[PDB]
Design a protein around this ligand. Sequence first.
Ligand SMILES: Nc1ncnc2c1ncn2[C@@H]1O[C@H](COP(=O)(O)OP(=O)(O)O)[C@@H](O)[C@H]1O
Ligand SMILES: Nc1ncnc2c1ncn2[C@@H]1O[C@H](COP(=O)(O)OP(=O)(O)O)[C@@H](O)[C@H]1O
Ligand SMILES: [Mg+2]
Ligand SMILES: [Mg+2]
Lengths: 98, 77, 31, 31, 523, 107, 76
Amino acid sequence: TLSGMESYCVRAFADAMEVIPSTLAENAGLNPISTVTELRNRHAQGEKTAGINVRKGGISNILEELVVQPLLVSVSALTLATETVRSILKIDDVVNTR
Amino acid sequence: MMDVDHQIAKLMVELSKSQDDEIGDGTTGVVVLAGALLEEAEQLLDRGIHPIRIADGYEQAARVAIEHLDKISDSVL
Amino acid sequence: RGKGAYQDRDKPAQIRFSNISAAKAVADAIR
Amino acid sequence: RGKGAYQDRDKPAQIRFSNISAAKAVADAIR
Amino acid sequence: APVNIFKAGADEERAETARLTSFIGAIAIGDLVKSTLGPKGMDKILLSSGRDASLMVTNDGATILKNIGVDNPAAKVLVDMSRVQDDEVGDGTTSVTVLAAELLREAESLIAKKIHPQTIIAGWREATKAAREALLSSAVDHGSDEVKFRQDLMNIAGTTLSSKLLTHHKDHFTKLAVEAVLRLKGSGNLEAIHIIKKLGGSLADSYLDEGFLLDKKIGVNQPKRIENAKILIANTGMDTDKIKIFGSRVRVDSTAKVAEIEHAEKEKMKEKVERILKHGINCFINRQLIYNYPEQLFGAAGVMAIEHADFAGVERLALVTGGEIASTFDHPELVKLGSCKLIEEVMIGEDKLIHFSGVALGEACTIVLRGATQQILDEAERSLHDALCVLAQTVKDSRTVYGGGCSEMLMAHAVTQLANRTPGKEAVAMESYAKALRMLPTIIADNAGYDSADLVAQLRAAHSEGNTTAGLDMREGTIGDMAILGITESFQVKRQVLLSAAEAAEVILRVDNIIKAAPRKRV
Amino acid sequence: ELLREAESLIAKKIHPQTIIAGWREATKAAREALLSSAVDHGSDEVKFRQDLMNIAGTTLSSKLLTHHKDHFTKLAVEAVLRLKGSGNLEAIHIIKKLGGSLADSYL
Amino acid sequence: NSGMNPIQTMTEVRARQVKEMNPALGIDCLHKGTNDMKQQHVIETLIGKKQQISLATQMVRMILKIDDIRKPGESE
Ligand SMILES: Nc1ncnc2c1ncn2[C@@H]1O[C@H](COP(=O)(O)OP(=O)(O)O)[C@@H](O)[C@H]1O
Ligand SMILES: Nc1ncnc2c1ncn2[C@@H]1O[C@H](COP(=O)(O)OP(=O)(O)O)[C@@H](O)[C@H]1O
Ligand SMILES: [Mg+2]
Ligand SMILES: [Mg+2]
């Protein structure tokens, strides 16, 4: 829905959110190429509670496996990390103090 | 004319020499292209894709680039 | 017309890639 | 008026005295 | 002096490398902080070699130059110049460093033109006098009609915070900076605004507290919240007094008399606390430490006891509650007590702080800075300190000028108009003074990525025929009116940028010999 | 002095290929200034020998032979005039001997 | 290198090769008016660009199919 240079950065913001399911699928011994691809197919249909099932070794329901994460954990992980990376591209000059 | 003692970057020196020995015009562009194929393979490496599976995917992709480049070609010398 | 040309011949285009490559090594360490 | 001012901020005003003082030591050696 | 050198380990240079090392060392200082000038300039990260390096990112030009430690002798004059600019007005330390370096860069262009350096000093003194009249005649005063003065104060804080890390927080941090000085209602002491930095949360979660925050929580068995209390603070010793008689011992004959003395010592410590509660108070703040024997007396009477807040902590509590220090308790009718509504304890970042909610005569504030990292909190504290110091002097001097490159083109126009009414000996030095004043909107325009060769040319054509309020619009990248956009700066800030850079460039240009002595412990 | 003015175009953010393309058009216009102002000399050889002494008088003015233009100009013009052909620049053998002033030198 | 933006220029040229049949559409420094490489006479050999893609692919395959480095330390 955006245009200009803003549309190329939200896609870079959205592609960086797929790293944590790629991290969870790679550490579980699953194939991370087909796991994150299947996760985008389940959430496009309407499955908002779909994720990586480390017990079955695939994609299943999360609330059936009783995996509950608080909202303040995930909101502050997105708010503090975005505020940090908004400063590193602004703070860039190496000055070695004597 | 560099003093690069790095065995991966030494292969980029022999790549520019091999373009000079065969054709001799695109010695600069063959290093930027080889660095571009390896830069795009860095993000694919973090997704768990096998490096030979990327190399097998580049051969099926470069085969399309050879056949498509032979569409419009004519000279009357 | 090209409507201008902004020549940027300065340092911090290379240091900006150094902060990116250093933070990628930390994320891959605890991956 | 002063009819101009010629500022000469350069080296060889001091090296010109070095060639003078070196040649005076030669003339005083065989004096 | 180089020929037949009569020095041990010291070296010198006269008129060849003296002005060469002075112009190299001063331009490299100005070219260092050149990238930090303007609303789109980047920031620096300062690091050491090791041994508790303590990295401190700063965008202000004074904090960069005070930590680098330049070995050049002439570069230390520009470092000390930006230190006075931070201590006097608190802003323009980066603008005074680039302006003093662009004067010496134009003076380096007068090396090959064989201009006498005393002619450039006499040419710049007449150029600085013409530039003082440009800012004084264009200053906008504000007396009555206070609804336009509070709107003018938000343009001062909006201009200062735009060149810092608080870029997309001007809807919040402008209100945190204007209302902090507006709650002072008097002199700009610049210490009643206690800034507390806590990790966790974004910069949008930061706020200005309506009361006051403190540490060193309330006792052991004392109440944590008292509604409608009378706050009495103190600066006296509670226990282990050893009261002011050096050389006094307890020389008794038996150990039964020692038990009578130590009971008499605790009775006088109990009688001192009994003189405090005759005022009818509920809270007690002592600058010194409170030991266990008076702490039990305040807990039995239902009185709070805040022990060892700070040396300057009782000063802010005296300005936010409306009381006095009251270090002696012998006249309850001559001791004025504080006033509050709630002394409940709040938790900010897993740390319990004493919140003095609902205080009367609150001429003190508490800014609760919350950031993602410690590097952001150290930058946002210096960014807020560069904004509160200008508003503390804008309420003392209400004269404001139009910033954003508009003030520099007004100063450069008055020099160029008087450069044509002068003979050719000093007119070339005055034209170099006007070109350095036009470099300050050129650094701002080129830091965003705009066409700096055309925007300053459009500013020079605008100010040549009218348009006294025309400046640089960094939002869209064009030329707009500064009175409409609301980009104004203080008169005393812009005067100290012009005056201190003209005096510092006068010192370095008059140097023809740099005789440095032999240093100690350097081999 | 071209690269000193090119150092002034560093802070103006001018692209360096624009300075190269700007100087190629500038050098092409500068060739037409010297070509249209060149003075030729064919016949009337009494004005060409006077023109040759102005060439040697300008070259020797920027050297150590300052107050010797009444002698060293005739030593340089008549040396090439006695060649009467190609400028081989080896038939003019210069012999350097100590003793005497520069006015004592001769052809 | 010409002073333009890489996104604002590559998106416009690539979109014009899909709306019509794909022409000789590139870029230039002074841009010569239009972006048609057939009118600007920017002609390169077929076997030159054929060996640019073929040699860079095989050199990438020999530096992707390697998982060990056995270099020594100091010289002596
Ligand atoms: N007039 C022009 N307009 C647009 N592009 C051009 C023009 N002239 C040359 N180029 C581009 O510049 C590039 C130069 O490549 P080059 O460095 O010569 O390759 P190699 O190093 O193999 O000789 C070519 O790929 C070509 O596409
Ligand atoms: N909104 C704006 N529009 C135009 N110019 C601005 C704006 N905000 C800030 N500036 C300019 O940015 C400059 C920042 O200078 P600064 O680095 O704060 O100086 P100092 O270090 O002395 O405080 C100011 O001179 C001001 O003219
Ligand atoms: Mg400022
Ligand atoms: Mg000559």
